[PDB]
Amino acid sequence: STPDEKIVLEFMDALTSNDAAKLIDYFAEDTMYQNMPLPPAYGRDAVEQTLAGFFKVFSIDAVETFHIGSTKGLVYTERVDVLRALPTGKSYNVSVLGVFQLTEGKITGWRDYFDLRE
Amino acid sequence: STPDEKIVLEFMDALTSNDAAKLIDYFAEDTMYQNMPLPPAYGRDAVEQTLAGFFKVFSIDAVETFHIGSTKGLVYTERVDVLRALPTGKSYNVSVLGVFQLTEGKITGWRDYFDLRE
């Protein structure tokens, strides 16, 4: 792996702890998250606040990563998240591509393309 | 219009209030909201919390409805929402079809299909 692909894979491992505070340590201050095509969450404060809000209605019970790659500086990775809506207990398998930008071993950009088919 | 299309058009007008309590009175207790393809919000409390949660990061500055109709007992309407993200001030126009199920003049089912192109 690249040092950047390694970082991304630890972050992917980390997701299942559903810990926004644990997760935001991977992100630089100058950073953003965009759950496509939704408008981005800008800055570290917002990404955290985004993870937190996500962790109050869902648990990530599992992440199965089945691809990791890189081109032109960006790490590309593909996974299936096993999502469990906490107010129901129902579980959902959904695919998602994660596109990461890193500057000096910290996340400066993160775009998710969840599978959005009916 | 039908009495059912009438109720939906009023609800549509009430949206710009950005007020969940105002909005929630259109829904029966046995009801649901589903932002496709996301899992539904089950029951009236959950629809309430979902709007309120939406009204903390966005304002609905304008609903421009350009279509309303009905088939099989369900009301279909189409609009463009002008969305302003509260943490940034940036505005966005997005289209969405609304599919409504009513029982005795109250909403028992609401599904949104927002335009999800990149």
Side-chain angles (χ1 to χ4, degrees):
Chain A
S1 302
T2 71
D4 293 331
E5 287 168 330
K6 272 144 184 173
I7 285 290
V8 180
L9 289 179
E10 303 177 32
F11 176 64
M12 288 306 179
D13 290 311
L15 285 172
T16 48
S17 76
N18 301 261
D19 189 329
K22 173 177 282 243
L23 293 159
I24 212 66
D25 280 322
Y26 289 94
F27 298 83
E29 286 300 338
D30 196 8
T31 190
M32 75 92 171
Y33 172 74
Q34 188 175 19
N35 190 2
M36 306 286 299
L38 308 176
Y42 292 99
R44 195 171 179 285
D45 161 54
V47 171
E48 183 157 18
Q49 185 173 349
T50 305
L51 302 171
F54 180 91
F55 289 135
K56 299 177 172 185
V57 258
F58 284 103
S59 169
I60 298 173
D61 288 354
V63 167
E64 268 69 7
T65 297
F66 58 94
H67 182 72
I68 185 127
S70 289
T71 173
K72 308 159 263 161
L74 292 50
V75 176
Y76 288 78
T77 180
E78 301 163 30
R79 60 208 158 284
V80 177
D81 297 332
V82 172
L83 302 185
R84 167 163 48 95
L86 315 174
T88 76
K90 304 176 200 300
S91 281
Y92 306 79
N93 289 5
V94 63
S95 49
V96 43
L97 163 71
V99 178
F100 289 90
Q101 231 178 123
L102 288 91
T103 296
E104 297 219 89
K106 286 291 187 196
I107 300 173
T108 54
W110 184 22
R111 300 200 325 271
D112 270 350
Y113 303 77
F114 284 85
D115 174 17
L116 313 174
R117 300 164 289 193
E118 260 236 28
Chain B
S1 306
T2 71
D4 276 358
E5 296 167 320
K6 241 46 163 273
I7 307 280
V8 178
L9 290 159
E10 299 175 46
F11 175 56
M12 286 300 169
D13 266 55
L15 286 171
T16 51
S17 67
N18 294 286
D19 176 35
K22 170 168 281 207
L23 295 173
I24 197 61
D25 226 78
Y26 285 96
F27 298 80
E29 282 299 346
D30 185 2
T31 189
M32 61 84 87
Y33 174 71
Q34 180 166 34
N35 191 1
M36 302 289 297
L38 309 179
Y42 288 105
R44 190 175 184 283
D45 162 70
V47 168
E48 190 161 39
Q49 301 186 203
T50 307
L51 301 170
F54 179 93
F55 290 140
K56 291 168 180 296
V57 265
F58 285 102
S59 171
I60 298 176
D61 293 10
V63 171
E64 288 133 75
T65 297
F66 63 88
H67 175 76
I68 178 136
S70 301
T71 159
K72 314 169 215 76
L74 294 52
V75 180
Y76 294 74
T77 175
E78 303 170 26
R79 59 213 167 270
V80 177
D81 294 335
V82 184
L83 298 180
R84 172 166 41 89
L86 316 181
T88 76
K90 293 171 164 304
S91 281
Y92 310 85
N93 294 333
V94 65
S95 55
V96 36
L97 155 69
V99 180
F100 289 87
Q101 286 177 44
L102 287 108
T103 307
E104 308 214 56
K106 292 283 181 183
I107 305 179
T108 43
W110 180 16
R111 272 192 318 273
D112 266 356
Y113 300 82
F114 285 87
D115 174 23
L116 305 174
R117 287 164 296 184
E118 241 205 85

